[PDB]
């Protein structure tokens, strides 16, 4: 599978802001 | 003619094109595809169920419920396709979006950092939130039914176990026994096989933070009593307070029946495991329904206090009751009921 990206680039942890 | 996977015929043109095969189950077979109309990929399963009453029964309470649930931590169904008329329909087709992996490969390729593992859990409880809140058990929570983006988006599928049971009405002795997948079985499942409540999504997602943080199953029996045992070896044996709430004579006297064993401490299975993490799945993992983590509470643990927010964490506007329960009809009256409610989405493209 790989390649699980930082967090950071979740919709949910984005709209946050 | 329609398009074909490994000799089924996957009738879902012109609009989904593209079909690329998946996997197969009990719950029948899935394709990804590409949807013209939206220009997007899309996951389809292949549905057959009108044979066997009780496949009927669990195909109009998936739908019911997916359909009626909005939540970015739970699957929508985007599509149903299925034959104009009645007597034509054998084979209901339910499209969703697709999605890149699931919890049970990620965990098969790459440990882990904390941080993910703590994020999806918060997530996977996020959605479980709004599911506790509609009065649905899930019951079938494991790795392989968390799918995954790589952005780390998660979201819960595989309702084909789940159902309504309203909270006004005490379901001791109507529910139905076997549910869960072996490893992931809470165990009053076993032991109060038809009176059991939704605190064993609470248990399966204990057994699923365990797998997070070690790569492997937690209590991996190879049977239906030997799961048991297993829980049993790194729980203990009850206490002489929970072997009381054992309210089924025949249960609390097999327990009675088996050797004691002692409590190993979740810091000696889990020597690297953040402490908030065991603490947490400690609570999960506890033998006593009654006494059991429930999700909010779970949710406001220290470990996810980094997420935690119920102002950014819906509930359900309307929660199920009891009316949409009595589902159990004559398999040719529940084909009379899926097909009203898949109506929604007709006609579909030629
Ligand atoms: C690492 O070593 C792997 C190497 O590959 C690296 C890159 O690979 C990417 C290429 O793709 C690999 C193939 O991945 C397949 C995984 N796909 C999915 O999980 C897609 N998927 N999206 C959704 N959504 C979805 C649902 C289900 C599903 C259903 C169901 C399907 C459709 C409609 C309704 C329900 N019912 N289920 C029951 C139980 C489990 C799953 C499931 N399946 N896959 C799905």
Redesign the interface.
């Given at each position: 599978?790989?390649?699980?990206?930082?967090?950071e680039?979740?919709?949910?942890?984005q709209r946050?802001v | 003619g329609p398009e074909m996977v490994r000799g089924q015929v996957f009738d879902v043109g012109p609009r989904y094109t593209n079909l690329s095969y998946i996997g197969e189950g009990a719950y029948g077979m899935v394709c990804s595809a590409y949807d013209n109309v939206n220009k997007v990929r899309v996951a389809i399963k292949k549905i057959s169920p009108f044979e066997h009453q009780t496949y009927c029964q669990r195909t109009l309470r998936e739908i019911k419920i997916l359909l009626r649930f909005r939540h970015e931590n739970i699957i929508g169904i985007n599509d149903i396709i299925r034959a104009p008329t009645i007597e034509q329909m054998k084979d209901v087709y339910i499209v969703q979006d697709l999605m890149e992996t699931d919890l049970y490969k990620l965990l098969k390729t790459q440990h882990l950092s904390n941080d993910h593992i703590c994020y999806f859990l918060y997530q996977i409880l996020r959605g479980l939130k709004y599911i506790h809140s509609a009065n649905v058990l899930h019951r079938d929570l494991k790795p392989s039914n968390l799918l995954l983006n790589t952005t780390c988006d998660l979201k819960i599928c595989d309702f084909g176990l789940a159902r309504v049971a309203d909270p006004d009405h005490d379901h001791t002795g109507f529910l139905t026994e076997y549910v869960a997948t072996r490893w992931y079985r809470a165990p009053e499942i076993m032991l109060n096989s038809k009176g059991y409540t939704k605190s064993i999504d609470i248990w399966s997602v204990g057994c699923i933070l365990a797998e997070m943080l070690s790569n492997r199953p937690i209590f991996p029996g190879k049977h239906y009593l030997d799961q048991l045992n297993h829980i049993l070896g790194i729980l203990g044996s009850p206490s002489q307070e929970d072997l009381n709430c054992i309210i089924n004579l025949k249960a609390r006297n097999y327990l009675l029946s088996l050797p004691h064993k002692n409590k190993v401490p979740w810091n000696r299975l889990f020597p690297n495991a953040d402490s908030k993490a065991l603490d947490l799945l400690d609570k999960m993992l506890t033998f006593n329904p009654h006494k059991r983590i429930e999700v909010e509470q779970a949710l406001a643990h220290p470990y996810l206090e980094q997420y935690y927010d119920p102002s950014d964490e819906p509930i359900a506007e309307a929660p199920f009751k009891f009316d949409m329960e009595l589902d159990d009809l004559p398999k040719e009256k529940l084909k009379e009921l899926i097909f009203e409610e898949t109506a929604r989405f007709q006609p579909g493209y030629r």
């Open positions: 599978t790989a390649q699980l990206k930082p967090i680039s979740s919709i949910l942890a946050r | -």
